[PDB]
Design a protein around this ligand. Structure first.
Ligand SMILES: O=c1[nH]c2cc(C(F)(F)F)c(N3CCOCC3)cc2n(CP(=O)(O)O)c1=O
Ligand SMILES: O=c1[nH]c2cc(C(F)(F)F)c(N3CCOCC3)cc2n(CP(=O)(O)O)c1=O
Ligand SMILES: O=c1[nH]c2cc(C(F)(F)F)c(N3CCOCC3)cc2n(CP(=O)(O)O)c1=O
Ligand SMILES: O=c1[nH]c2cc(C(F)(F)F)c(N3CCOCC3)cc2n(CP(=O)(O)O)c1=O
Lengths: 175, 375, 381, 379, 379, 176
């Protein structure tokens, strides 16, 4: 009953916090690039060097069908729509837990959660395609658990979505 | 006897031990060894000299003075020209030439053809488009005949069996083709492989500012070199290169880039240089030659002509070219092809199916929403 | 005064005109060398009357009799000043007379018979599993069908499950076999490469090759010191079949008879002419083995040695030599007018070899719809 | 100067049939050209003797009369003899010998097999052996766990998980099998069941026979190493008459049948038969012994030192290996096509696919027997 | 009277005794050469005293500015009787002194490091793909599962989802099968190095020898076409010989991880095959034919008995027995003293073990969640 | 369609007997070319005899996991099993036509029909596996005779009489 409501509410709140720490620091990928195989930590909009003679010197970064994919990778509209969709879903579940008289808002919020998972999977697959589509000529493919808690956000969003669907079924049976 | 020689990369090198001796045995390569061979064939005391002009010899046609090795020969300062020089009509009434010992012509070289890394076309590489929308036609035919027989039975079992056998043959042919493609990893030469295949393509081509290439391209009546000239003139002003170093720096940058249109000497020299990345020769165009020169009224002209002709016929310059052009190389992969690591498939070769599946799921949930809305 | 020129007609230089004797003689001559002779006569100005060679030979050194023959033999023994007919350059030719310039660059070429691609119809569909086991799986399928029908009607059951499992195992094993076999055919047909250059021909053994005895190619190969050409000559010496041939035509018709494995290594111009011949039965690959050249022939001390040198250099610079070569080697050729007729090289399973499954698919749906109509009309009775 | 050689050797031959370059320079081969090469160094007069005796050279105890080339040498009719002599003791106390120009050694002979067409073994050849009942054990485990799951609490999540993992299992096992079978069919590697002389003694599945009488038979009977004692004890129990009378009979017998009747012979004759018209031979390498072929002179003289220095200086110089290589590898056309030919596609015949056909038909048969039996007995 | 013999301290022939000083005299060294000397002294009959050469080098008969070294110089100087030692037969040594017989055949071997690839477990399961590919396949499984669940609970969207999932797993299975087949048939078509023409054809593994010596003289005076090609390839010397002595080259080859090769004598290779740790093997045959010998004076009475005794011992086979026991009994290896690895291709439960492990793990997870379901039924 | 189906079943059984007699009396089992030189020969299990050549008139027959297959191919137990099971099924259907009061006989006859299909299909597969195993060489081979076609016709007529007999056995037991 209300225990699952509390569970999905705290799951959504943890999803928002995990989302903002995902779209916060730029600790996404570790590569042996050049500030020589020097180790730098790369994110989305900025990349700096954690060791070497250029300590403290941080620089900005960027980037028919291939043009569309690289434009999507550079603009990163997929995470923007994902986080906007997640925030709208959170506002909808806040309204649902505030306004008990509304019926279709639970099904709507489940739809927003499933589409948030959809946005997450398309964003992660376009990110791997973008950063592996340039092989050029060892340990260049290293991960700093960023995609690991991205996967955690994905699975918790899927869990709260299926819980919302199940409780829509329950509340329609109770009607 | 004294002979002039210009400093060039296929022919004469400064020795690593510069302090070994100043004089005769101070340079190595094709040209000095050819000079030593013809000197041993004829019999004469020969030295090594360097022209202080730095040019190959062209008539300026305003002050009426000849420069370079041909100018040194004309102005009574040299008698032997072992340095290679292309035979031209203007440089025939002022200097007499021997028979050419090397055949060269305008050639094509292109950047290194690497493996393709597409996003969607990688999935499209096995089979072809025709087979695939014939699969679509077969699928819609199966759907419509199933809907026809719908309105346990023998017909259903037969249609299920033939559909299963059909998709079975499709998966087997697809898997066999993809396995062959991954096993052989055979590279395919680009479109720029012939004169015309270079003509209709969209790849920008570049050349030097002035020289034999520009002189040949000034006048043409073949109606294909006219098309090439119109393509060159209507392109960007970055086609013209002041020096070949800037041109090679341009062509090593992009896969298409500004491809050269030059003679084969630097092609065969650079196919086996220290950066073994480009080793492409394509086809051959035009016809030129390289020969030694001798001023008029000199009795050694006939002797050196017979010497170079005998040396070319019995064969000693071909041996020198093979030893110092193919055997002398930083890498051995150009002469004989090698293999490479197959490595992992990554995702860029299989990224096509992922997008199709996720878009299908998305369109399924939209059409489910539309079904809810309309009902 | 007038001047005469000695030319030899083999191919395709001094070919006679279509009207033959209906013309006036000298004015009936079309080809490469005769047009070049007319042009170089127009450049400097002299009579270009044509003469007839005596024996039809090109000339060779005969130190035993100290005699001469051919165009060079006619020119050395007076009554000749210009030999327009192209000829190879040897040491004795430069020893007795002098040449000015080579008007073309050419050499020894290595050839191979052109393969033909003929994708079959339904035959390629059952190709990768022989003939009899398609029959075997057909009656295996009807056997598993009759077993399933009898166990369904005679009786979820345990006996049905084992039959379904062994049928499933059968299908997966035989289709794994078909996939492995088809991958084997595709890979084997794919890694093979056409012959090229001379060293790849040297490692190859079953392909075989040979050249004529009465030619400069055999002398060049015997006197060569290149290790690759040394291997060429050492294998050519150990020749058990009748590899050698006397003339070109017999060797070429023998090649066209077999057309599976041979190489003759003849001169570049003749190979190009055969490439532009209506048989269309060969492909040219690789480059020139040597750097032989042609040239014009003049006597010593003649007044027509320097003007012909400037004339041939003018033709070389102006590109009219390339114009004549294109006109008389590609425009007049009845074969290979479009040289780039097959250059896409799309190496994939097309619709020309996998259409057998589509044909049996259409047949199976045809039988399915007829038996459905039979059931429907039986119901309607 | 008279020099002699044997004619019944694969080193000399008659040019054409008759009247082909008649004279001293009539025969061609390794031996005559080597004799000419060593004659051109010191400057001796080359000639031909080729006197036959029906034997290569021996010393009977009761007759005490030497025969062959050595028999000609001891009594005296020539001063230089180049012939394939295996230098041993009893010929050494009589006349001297020079440094051998080539190695020797007994090498085993086996006919090279072409392919294998088994039945059930063809079915079981790819993947492995223990994997098959590993899958059947796994299948029994999945079946019993599914039945106990259904009986305990009748799909849900557990059914979905077990179905998915079984689907993953079947896809991965068929992918591995297809990959292995494709790798087998695209290219093949040949290793042969025979590998070494020790493995030859260990296998005890192929018949071995050296010769009826000769150097190989004498070495086998007078051997001392324990593996050769095992080989000799195997030779004692020789039922199908493996005592080959002649070397031609042995190679003719081993050419027809490859499953047994292996031949024992020296490396020279084995390498000569490697390049002969049937073109079907195989050797594993390794020489059991170490002899050589050398020239001999009657006692000691000035020709002894000259021929010894001549043959030695030819041994360090690259000319004897020149002659050996060019002769043996140019009159034999089989070895020109080195390694193998990739133009052998063929197709999957019935013999290597019929095993699963038998399994299917037996499975359906025993299935309908057990079905009728259980329906007749349970009711 | 007494006789003196000389021997050089060498690893395959002479043992430096650990007890040493407590057993002095004739029993100071043990090994092949001194046992040969003892056997031939027992055969002919005399007293032999061991000696050590002053320079400690093999020496040569090169016509330098006098001062000849080695056993040949020590014997031509007159202060020697016999010299049994490992010595290479050459014309400059033969010019003043003769040798008895070649009792051992020497060839040129090629150094190849031992190819050992331990098969991994679960890592080899994920080998013919990428880690992000497996992340994406599990993500797509979760996605298709949740779409199927929502379309089942909402209620042909379910049919089209099933069809696109079938198409997706169709492509995934086909791609994985193709990739695994490609990897396995690439691993199958590898070519092990045999003889010299394979080395001249591969042009990928660096090969070199000592700067001077018999091998360098053979390479400098090479005339075999493939050996001439190899000599011209090594004449470029882009990585050079990169060697100083035998052990330095051995260390370089071992540390090169199979990317470097050395051409040393077959005797040294066979000795280092078992004494060294098992990381190099002998492949192919002898590149040249040469032998050994025992130095004897040209005008002494000890010239014929030494030849007779050494040839008798070679024919008897006790020399082969002694060599075999000395080179196999005291060997720190198991390549020849034990069974080798049989090449049977196929698999041996190496790469498919990890997928079996995840199979059992998935069945375990399924049965535990079914246990959770049954305990939830208990309630 | 009951009496006409009885007629169809007995005609099919008689046709199966005729095809069995033709198969066991066949001399041209397979068109294999060879020597009696490669010339066409009519291979026969009982008498392998030639039609073209100078030796026409005199002729002689052909002859763990491999011994058993060779033994059962040489003994040729498959035609014996085929004729025995076909005769048993034919006698059963003839007795069923004679006396109709029994109903297990027709189910039994279906059992002999399907087991005769079993026997002749295993005979076919063993014969093809036996004669296809010739890897010693023969550019042109196979080109099978009409005996295989007649055996296939016997197999299909046996399976169709079997399914028809089982189906109407279940029927005639149902309305009983
Ligand atoms: O006879 C001639 N032979 C030439 C040979 C070469 C080279 F290929 F390097 F060997 C060159 N290079 C062109 C590119 O820049 C470096 C010099 C120029 C030559 N030129 C003058 P062009 O008029 O500029 O061709 C001649 O006249
Ligand atoms: O001056 C010479 N010019 C030649 C020109 C050609 C041709 F190609 F036809 F133009 C040929 N053909 C080569 C191919 O087979 C037919 C004859 C031979 C020539 N020879 C004799 P070869 O070169 O000794 O055989 C000469 O001597
Ligand atoms: O002097 C001799 N030179 C020999 C040379 C050879 C060989 F070179 F191999 F041809 C052989 N082969 C032995 C194997 O069968 C073929 C002949 C025998 C020789 N024998 C007789 P053995 O006593 O049987 O060695 C001699 O006496
Ligand atoms: O007479 C000679 N006998 C030799 C005997 C041997 C060996 F048997 F191996 F001990 C060797 N080894 C070569 C490999 O490294 C270790 C020394 C060298 C010898 N050398 C000098 P080479 O000219 O370098 O062969 C001679 O001169």
């Amino acid at each position: 009953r209300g225990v699952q409501m509390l569970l999905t509410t705290v799951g959504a709140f943890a999803a928002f916090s995990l989302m903002t720490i995902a779209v916060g620091t730029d600790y996404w990928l570790y590569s042996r690039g050049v500030c020589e195989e020097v180790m730098t930590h790369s994110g989305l909009w900025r990349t700096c060097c954690l060791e070497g003679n250029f300590k403290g010197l941080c620089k900005q970064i960027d980037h028919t069908a291939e043009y569309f994919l690289r434009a999507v990778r550079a603009s990163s509209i997929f995470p923007i729509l994902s986080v906007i969709l997640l925030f709208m879903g959170g506002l909808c579940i806040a309204a649902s837990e505030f306004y008990k008289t509304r019926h279709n808002i639970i099904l709507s919020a489940g739809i927003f959660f499933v589409s948030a998972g959809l946005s997450n999977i398309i964003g992660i697959i376009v990110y791997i395609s973008a950063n592996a589509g340039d092989p050029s000529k060892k340990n260049s493919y290293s991960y700093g658990w960023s995609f690991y808690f991205g996967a955690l956000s994905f699975i918790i969003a899927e869990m709260v979505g299926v819980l919302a669907v199940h409780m829509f079924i329950d509340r329609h049976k109770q009607l | 006897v004294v002979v002039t020689t210009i400093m060039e990369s296929p022919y004469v090198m400064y020795k690593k031990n510069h302090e070994m001796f100043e004089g005769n045995d101070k340079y190595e390569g094709y040209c000095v060894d050819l000079a030593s061979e013809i000197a041993k064939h004829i019999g004469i005391k020969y030295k090594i000299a360097i022209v202080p002009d730095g040019k190959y010899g062209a008539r300026d046609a305003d002050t009426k003075i000849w420069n370079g090795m041909v100018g040194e020969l004309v102005y009574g300062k040299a008698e032997i020209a072992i340095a290679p020089l292309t035979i031209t009509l203007v440089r025939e009434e002022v200097i007499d030439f021997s028979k050419p010992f090397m055949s060269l012509g305008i050639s094509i070289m292109i950047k290194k053809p690497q493996k393709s890394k597409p996003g969607v076309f990688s999935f499209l590489d096995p089979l072809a488009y025709e087979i695939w929308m014939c699969i679509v036609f077969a699928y819609i035919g199966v759907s419509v005949v199933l809907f026809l027989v719908s309105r346990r039975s023998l017909s259903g079992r037969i249609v299920g069996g033939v559909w299963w056998f059909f998709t079975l043959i499709i998966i087997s042919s697809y898997t066999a083709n993809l396995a062959a493609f991954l096993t052989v990893e055979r590279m395919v030469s680009p479109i720029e492989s012939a004169e015309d295949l270079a003509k209709q393509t969209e790849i920008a081509y570049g050349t030097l500012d002035s020289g034999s290439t520009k002189e040949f391209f000034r006048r043409s009546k073949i109606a294909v070199y006219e098309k090439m000239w119109t393509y060159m003139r209507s392109a960007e002003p970055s086609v013209f290169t002041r020096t070949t170093a800037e041109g090679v720096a341009r062509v090593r940058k992009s896969k298409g880039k500004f491809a050269f249109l030059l003679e084969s000497t630097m092609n065969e020299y650079t196919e086996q240089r220290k950066p073994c990345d480009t080793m492409k020769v394509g086809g051959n165009l035009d016809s030129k030659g390289y020969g030694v020169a001798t001023p008029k009224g000199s009795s050694l002209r006939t002797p050196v002509n017979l010497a170079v002709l005998k040396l070319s016929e019995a064969g000693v310059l071909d041996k020198l070219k093979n030893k110092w052009w193919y055997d002398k190389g930083e890498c051995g992969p150009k002469d004989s092809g090698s293999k490479d690591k197959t490595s992992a498939l990554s995702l860029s070769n299989v990224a096509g199916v992922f997008y199709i599946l996720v878009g299908g799921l998305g369109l399924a949930m939209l059409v489910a929403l539309i079904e809810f809305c309309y009902k």
